[PDB]
């Protein structure tokens, strides 16, 4: 609550994660263009660029609401003030201002991570699984995005415990570990699931994205979510949160009764297992049996542990962030 030194190290660790993630994408995008993979190149740059542009819209709106100029209040600008405030706390209500600026940053980097990392990890797993061995530069992007998702999920988890007192039971090292391994395991099962579908027909998978994007868009509209003061700006948040629910659940508005999450993951469990049965009962000549059965074990076992970690989460635990995504 007092923005301890460990929290400052969380902020310091973030700036390396942010800069390395940005520079790796630029290096990877240049590598693709040098290697002739234009399609993989523009997509790699599009996800980081479109992810950054969306986050900048929230960042500029939040600064303007509480208040050239468009880029003067970007994500990088927020980092510099947070580092200054964190250093002042170490040298020494300043803590309340410091933690408030930190939680505002956690929201933005969660969107930045899940609007870029999730669409890119599918792309990189598509490129790594197709050519077999990949290269060193592709490994850095996969690892940093895996760290960016891992780091952002923990930092966002810490922000909830400190901002609103409702998450009082969340204190402890274990809950930030079970939830972290929750997100990796349930995503890795879904990341590999989409990639398998992404090999047979790319067009159909993107059509399924739109159907799952609209459902997420509709559900938040049904849930009457309100996060942004501006009417026009809020639909951007409604549209974005729908995209995130395509990959992982986030319990919009945090006022649900655990029913939508169960209905979401019931579709996930039968949907993921339903895909494999089609690929198992009906063999596919495209796929290779030698490498497929490692994947089939990987996708099921990760989902098997992913659900178990989710069950552990509820069996033990369950001013501005009260409207952001909460719960699991």
């Amino acid at each position: 609550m007092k923005y301890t030194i460990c929290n400052f190290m969380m902020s310091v660790l973030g700036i390396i994660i942010y800069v390395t993630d940005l520079v790796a994408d630029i290096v990877l995008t240049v590598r693709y263009f040098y290697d002739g993979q234009y399609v993989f190149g523009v997509l790699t740059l599009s996800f980081v660029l479109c992810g950054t542009l969306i986050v900048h819209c929230f960042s500029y709106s939040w600064l303007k609401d509480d208040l050239l100029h468009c880029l003067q209040g970007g994500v990088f600008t927020r980092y510099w003030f947070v580092l200054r405030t964190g250093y002042h706390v170490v040298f020494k209500d300043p803590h309340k201002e410091a933690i408030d600026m930190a939680t505002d940053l956690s929201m933005l980097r969660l969107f930045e991570t899940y609007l870029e990392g999730c669409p890119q990890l599918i792309l990189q797993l598509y490129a790594f699984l197709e050519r077999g061995q990949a290269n060193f530069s592709q490994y850095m992007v996969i690892m940093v995005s895996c760290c960016a998702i891992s780091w952002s999920t923990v930092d966002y988890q810490i922000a909830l415990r400190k901002s609103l007192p409702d998450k009082n039971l969340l204190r402890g090292f274990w809950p930030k570990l079970t939830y972290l391994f929750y997100k990796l395991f349930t995503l890795l099962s879904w990341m590999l699931s989409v990639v398998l579908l992404l090999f047979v027909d790319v067009r159909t998978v993107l059509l399924l994205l739109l159907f799952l994007w609209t459902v997420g868009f509709i559900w938040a509209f049904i849930n009457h979510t309100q996060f942004c003061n501006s009417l026009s700006m809020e639909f951007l948040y409604r549209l974005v949160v729908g995209f995130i629910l395509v990959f992982t659940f986030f319990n919009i508005k945090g006022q649900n009764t655990k029913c939508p999450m169960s209905c979401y993951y019931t579709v996930r469990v039968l949907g993921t297992l339903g895909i494999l049965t089609v690929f198992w009962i009906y063999p596919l000549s495209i796929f290779n049996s030698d490498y497929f059965i490692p994947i089939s074990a990987t996708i099921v076992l990760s989902l098997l542990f992913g659900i178990i970690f989710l069950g552990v989460y509820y069996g033990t635990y369950h001013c501005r962030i009260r409207y952001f995504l909460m719960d699991a």
Epitope: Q37, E130, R131, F199, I286, N288, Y291, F292
Partner: nanobody, 126 residues
Framework: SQVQLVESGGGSVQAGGSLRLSCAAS????????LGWFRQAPGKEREGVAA????????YYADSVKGRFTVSLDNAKNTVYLQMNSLKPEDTALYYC???????????????????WGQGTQVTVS
């Protein structure tokens, strides 16, 4: 790049004749699964002429040249040889030899399937 490809045998052959092209892999190919050939001429994209598996030897072909070419691999020199018979003018193209590591996708004809390629040789048919 510990592994490199050396290609030779390209040239100009009268239509209806025969031509043999050699492609040698320098380095290690212990885990190399696929390796085949492609042809490049202006005005169209790469297409898989033929391919084979280092382990088994199943010679996957293309419908355009099925039952016409003979591709084989000899493990003594780690070299792959492709033979052409009854050449036609449309066969004139830049022929690239490439190899691919093993992976989930089993399709030894996709251009993007293969990992590293070679310089290639020119083949002319009159």
């Amino acid at each position: 790049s510990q592994v490199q490809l050396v290609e030779s045998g390209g040239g100009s052959v009268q239509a209806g004749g025969s031509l043999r092209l050699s492609c040698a892999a320098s380095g290690n190919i212990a885990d190399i699964y696929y390796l085949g050939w492609f042809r490049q001429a202006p005005g169209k994209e790469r297409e898989g002429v033929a391919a084979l598996i280092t382990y088994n030897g199943r010679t996957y072909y293309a419908d355009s040249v099925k039952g016409r070419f003979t591709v084989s691999l000899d493990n003594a020199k780690n070299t792959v040889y492709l033979q052409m018979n009854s050449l036609k003018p449309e066969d004139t193209a830049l022929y690239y030899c490439a190899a691919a590591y093993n992976g989930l996708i089993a399709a030894p004809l996709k251009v993007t399937r293969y990992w590293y390629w070679g310089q290639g040789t020119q083949v002319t048919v009159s």
